[PDB]
Design a protein around this ligand. Structure first.
Ligand SMILES: [Mg+2]
Ligand SMILES: [Mg+2]
Ligand SMILES: [Mg+2]
Ligand SMILES: [Mg+2]
Ligand SMILES: [Mg+2]
Ligand SMILES: [Mg+2]
Ligand SMILES: [Mg+2]
Ligand SMILES: [Mg+2]
Ligand SMILES: [Mg+2]
Ligand SMILES: [Mg+2]
Ligand SMILES: [Mg+2]
Ligand SMILES: [Mg+2]
Ligand SMILES: [Mg+2]
Ligand SMILES: [Mg+2]
Ligand SMILES: [Mg+2]
Ligand SMILES: [Mg+2]
Ligand SMILES: [Mg+2]
Ligand SMILES: [Mg+2]
Ligand SMILES: [Mg+2]
Ligand SMILES: [Mg+2]
Ligand SMILES: [Mg+2]
Ligand SMILES: [Mg+2]
Ligand SMILES: [Mg+2]
Ligand SMILES: [Mg+2]
Ligand SMILES: [Mg+2]
Ligand SMILES: [Mg+2]
Ligand SMILES: [Mg+2]
Ligand SMILES: [Mg+2]
Ligand SMILES: [Mg+2]
Ligand SMILES: [Mg+2]
Ligand SMILES: [Mg+2]
Ligand SMILES: [Mg+2]
Ligand SMILES: [Mg+2]
Ligand SMILES: [Mg+2]
Ligand SMILES: [Mg+2]
Ligand SMILES: [Mg+2]
Ligand SMILES: [Mg+2]
Ligand SMILES: [Mg+2]
Ligand SMILES: [Mg+2]
Ligand SMILES: [Mg+2]
Ligand SMILES: [Mg+2]
Ligand SMILES: [Mg+2]
Ligand SMILES: [Mg+2]
Ligand SMILES: [Mg+2]
Ligand SMILES: [Mg+2]
Ligand SMILES: [Mg+2]
Ligand SMILES: [Mg+2]
Ligand SMILES: [Mg+2]
Ligand SMILES: [Mg+2]
Ligand SMILES: [Mg+2]
Ligand SMILES: [Mg+2]
Ligand SMILES: [Mg+2]
Ligand SMILES: [Mg+2]
Ligand SMILES: [Mg+2]
Ligand SMILES: [Mg+2]
Ligand SMILES: [Mg+2]
Ligand SMILES: [Mg+2]
Lengths: 271, 93, 46
RNA sequence: AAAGCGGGUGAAAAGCCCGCUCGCCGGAAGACCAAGGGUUCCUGUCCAACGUUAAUCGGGGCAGGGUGAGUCGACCCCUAAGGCGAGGCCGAAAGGCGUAGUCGAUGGGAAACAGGUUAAUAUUCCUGUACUUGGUGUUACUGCGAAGGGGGGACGGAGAAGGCUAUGUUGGCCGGGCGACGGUUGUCCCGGUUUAAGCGUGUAGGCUGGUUUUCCAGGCAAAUCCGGAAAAUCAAGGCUGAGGCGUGAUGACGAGGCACUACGGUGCUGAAGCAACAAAUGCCCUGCUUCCAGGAAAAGCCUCUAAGCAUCAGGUAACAUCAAAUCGUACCCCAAACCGACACAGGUGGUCAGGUAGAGAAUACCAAGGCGCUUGAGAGAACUCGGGUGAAGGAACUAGGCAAAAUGGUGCCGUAACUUCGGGAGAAGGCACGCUGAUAUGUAGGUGAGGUCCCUCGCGGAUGGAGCUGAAAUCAGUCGAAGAUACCAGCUGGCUGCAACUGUUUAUUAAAAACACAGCACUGUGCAAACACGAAAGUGGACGUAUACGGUGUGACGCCUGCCCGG
RNA sequence: ACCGAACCGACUAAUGUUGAAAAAUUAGCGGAUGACUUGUGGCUGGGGGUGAAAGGCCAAUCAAACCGGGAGAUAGCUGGU
């Protein structure tokens, strides 16, 4: 729920937090945890390639089943869990044959539910079907691009992908950007919007909260020196320049997509 | 088996000092200067077979060199090993 | 005041030691230069 | 931070040695280490040079001695970040990345304590009592086996309380004393009242339902193991665990007393060796409660089987024997030995943590212990430095209350505009405070013996209050100029610019109104993402997927954000 | 969040300025459960890194480190001859 903090300190005055009572409170599933080390935005040459990444809390990776390949076996949704690696919550689900998995939690799914994957599965949230079997007009998530590859679209909290057409071997999906994309009809997709929509209503309230999530501060080019940024310099506050990225490319309006390989699949841009 | 070649090479010299004499007259221990690459088993076998006595245990330590000056020319006296050999109450070298 | 030399034998040997000199190709050039000069001590190990 | 005197040695003593005083530190200026150094450690001798003076002295010269490990640390097994990297992908050459592997602690992994001894080492030597791992050989039973499956190792922040211990105080007991000057056989004074690891028992506390069948799309194949499903049956079963107690210990240690001394210290003997109370930041506790920011890996360990061996090997349990190699161990370590060219007001990580007053690791004085800072002696000018006090005035000084002075603690009474309803606020302002007696020969509260009762029977529960400790208050009296008496310890109020705030910044003249910020808007990006590092392969973005990521500008919040597309 | 030691820092004043010190001492001062601070180790390299942005920091050196080399650069300039 969206609960506002009382202003007993200047940092806590503006804080809005999302508290979920349905989440598990114990330790997560040790067979399915893994380590990941933080990079600080540094690649194998050691240089900062992505700025403003570093620090934050230590995290463990949860192996999440995006393929949803164990088809034909009914599964009992056991519990909902906090995954620190993504916006959405995960669900520990127990299959009928004794093997446990982590999945994304769709909206409305609760503890002790029924889900099932495969071509013969029913049309209800949490169930995974190929989009040749999924009826048109229906909202899905965790959508694949290639058959058997794994889910890649509508994976953050509260997002969904709407199937608008089916023309032969391809279906047209309207994506949360507003984008119409043709994808193969053999690709899998799980019904229902992803949960944790209230995730967008959070207010961090302080720079400390940002640093806990692991983002270093951002310095404006107009505050830099001329040698550092194309915007830097001036006595007082001077700009007089067209807005560019630190490497010199214009940053307000200039389109940067160039992929003639997938221009054939893109039907309409996000406008 | 440790060869007689090896034993006759590893035992170097006796050691004389106030502490060595006190060890001899108190704990039935002899103090031997020993070549550096000799181990405890080699020292024990060499003493036991050359001095015709019997050894309880042996304790080793490496004595470090000393930096000396000979007419404003710096030099370095070398290392050696020292062995405290304990005998079984009835040998009395 | 904290000065620039805070010594450590491990970091000294991993930085300027003989095995690091032989590990990099230009370190072997450094050893060639020092041997051709005739240094008593090539690297920091001795 | 501070010295004075007597004796000794010597050619010579302010500085060396010994003694008696005096002063300083005592969450350090004490004790032990890691890092770093390398003989500076101890003894004998010397005073050329070094020591900001002298030198008989030294961390100086010279010579000799000194560092003893199955249990401490390294080495070793195992991994993190990261390094190297057979083949490989890539690149004019050199080389870049990287799979299998293999290194890499700052982390995980078996085991020793007390007393004694040397001029210099000791958890290493000696005495006493223990513990661990591995190989061999007998005995008894037996399905053993991994590079594979499972469990475990295995993990955050904050908070709160209970139980304890280290430790301290007092009482009892034992040994000693009857005081240079009034009094001191007494409710008097000084000191001691220590004892470990290990082994046995398993308590406060914490966690979890056990036990037996049958079945299964899972755990890369198998599984008697893990998981899952269905039955039956029992209710206490298991795991963890400080402390206490017994033993170790008829032992050791012990104030002192007795005798030599090369007066430095040795040899002999040795009484009491308990209780109550207070109590940790240490232990139970890798716990419990709660929060969001969701909190290493692998081996050692336990367990299941494959291939294989199949009355063999192999495993478990007992006993005996053997082995545990090699390297460090001196000394300094908040410093005269490390980093600062110096015997340099600097810097340097962890461990221990006594008394009184105190909330306290502040502060004042002290204990254990260590020092008096390697030039002194005089004199008592100007002037400079660090302080103390000051008539009358009280900012008149000055750029400016800069500096100094002042305020300063606990309890209670009381407290405005404004406000985002939290604040402002400790607003402002005021009163009490010492000591003695009584309430009360020491109260409320805390702890709790003896005795009695009960029992699924002992480290058990109920009663019961001995004894110990002990606030706070009221009343009365009394002393001083003054009772938070020292040290320690807010100056307050009013109008206003800027930036919302906590923070960051020009190491070494600038701490700000600059930078950041949460929030806001625009814009790019459909994933082999945009973008960045890279001639490339690759990698970050991200093991993320438009409620996400990059770039740009503004900068909480409230009310708003108007017109212009000519350049 | 508040007051305040350890610890981190560096706002004001005096001293010092051939210093005790190539940046400190003394008396006050700010943070002190966090965007904290710290030990050991690793990574990023010079038109490059890193930068809560001061052209700051990269070994007492930074509007382009240090070391060797082209090199005896060049100098219509100064000094000396
Ligand atoms: Mg950014
Ligand atoms: Mg921003
Ligand atoms: Mg600027
Ligand atoms: Mg430019
Ligand atoms: Mg202007
Ligand atoms: Mg203009
Ligand atoms: Mg021994
Ligand atoms: Mg040794
Ligand atoms: Mg004298
Ligand atoms: Mg003196
Ligand atoms: Mg004296
Ligand atoms: Mg004192
Ligand atoms: Mg010497
Ligand atoms: Mg000495
Ligand atoms: Mg003389
Ligand atoms: Mg002299
Ligand atoms: Mg000497
Ligand atoms: Mg590696
Ligand atoms: Mg190769
Ligand atoms: Mg490589
Ligand atoms: Mg290894
Ligand atoms: Mg280690
Ligand atoms: Mg010593
Ligand atoms: Mg006690
Ligand atoms: Mg604490
Ligand atoms: Mg020592
Ligand atoms: Mg001195
Ligand atoms: Mg000093
Ligand atoms: Mg310190
Ligand atoms: Mg103090
Ligand atoms: Mg005077
Ligand atoms: Mg004066
Ligand atoms: Mg005064
Ligand atoms: Mg006056
Ligand atoms: Mg007056
Ligand atoms: Mg007045
Ligand atoms: Mg005037
Ligand atoms: Mg005036
Ligand atoms: Mg002032
Ligand atoms: Mg004052
Ligand atoms: Mg009273
Ligand atoms: Mg004005
Ligand atoms: Mg500000
Ligand atoms: Mg400055
Ligand atoms: Mg701005
Ligand atoms: Mg406008
Ligand atoms: Mg705070
Ligand atoms: Mg700073
Ligand atoms: Mg300043
Ligand atoms: Mg200060
Ligand atoms: Mg504050
Ligand atoms: Mg404070
Ligand atoms: Mg500028
Ligand atoms: Mg510098
Ligand atoms: Mg240049
Ligand atoms: Mg040329
Ligand atoms: Mg020239």
């Amino acid at each position: 729920a969206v609960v506002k903090c009382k202003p007993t300190s200047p940092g806590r005055r503006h804080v809005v937090k999302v508290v979920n009572p349905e989440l598990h409170k114990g330790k997560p599933f040790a067979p399915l945890l893994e380590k990941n080390s933080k990079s600080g935005g540094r690649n194998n040459n050691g240089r900062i390639t992505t700025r403003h990444i570093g620090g934050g809390h230590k995290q463990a990776y949860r192996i999440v089943d995006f393929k949803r390949n164990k088809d034909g076996i009914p599964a009992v949704v056991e519990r909902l869990e906090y995954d620190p690696n993504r916006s959405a919550n995960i669900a520990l689900v127990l299959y009928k044959d004794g093997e446990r998995r982590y999945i994304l939690a769709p909206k409305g799914l609760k503890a002790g539910d029924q889900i099932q994957s495969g071509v013969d599965a029913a049309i209800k949230p949490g169930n995974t079907l190929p989009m040749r079997n999924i009826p048109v007009g229906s909202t899905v998530h965790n959508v694949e691009m290639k058959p058997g590859k794994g889910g890649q679209l509508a994976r953050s909290a509260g997002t969904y992908v709407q199937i608008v057409a089916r023309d032969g071997a391809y279906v047209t999906l309207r994506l949360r950007s507003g984008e119409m994309r043709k994808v193969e009809a053999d690709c899998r997709a799980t019904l229902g919007e992803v949960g944790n929509a209230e995730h967008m209503l959070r207010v961090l309230g302080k720079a400390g909260a940002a640093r806990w999530r692991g983002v270093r501060p951002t310095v404006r080019g107009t505050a830099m020196n001329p040698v550092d940024h194309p915007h830097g310099g001036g006595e007082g506050r001077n700009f007089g320049k067209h807005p560019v990225t630190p490497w010199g490319v214009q940053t307000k309006g200039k389109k940067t997509r160039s992929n003639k390989r997938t221009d054939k699949f893109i039907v309409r841009r996000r406008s | 088996m440790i060869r007689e070649e090896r034993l006759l090479k590893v035992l170097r010299a006796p050691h004389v000092s106030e502490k060595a004499s006190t060890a001899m007259e108190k704990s039935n221990t002899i103090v031997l200067k020993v070549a550096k690459d000799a181990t405890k088993a080699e020292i024990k076998a060499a003493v036991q077979k050359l001095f015709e006595v019997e050894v309880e245990v042996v304790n080793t330590l490496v004595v470090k060199g000393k930096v000396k000056r000979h007419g404003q020319r710096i030099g370095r006296r070398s290392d050696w090993k020292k062995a405290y050999v304990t005998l079984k109450e009835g040998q009395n070298l | 005041m904290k000065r620039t030399f805070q010594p450590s034998v491990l970091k000294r040997n991993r930085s300027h030691g003989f095995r690091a000199r032989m590990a990099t190709k230009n370190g072997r050039q450094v050893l060639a230069r020092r041997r051709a000069k005739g240094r008593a001590r090539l690297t920091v190990s001795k």
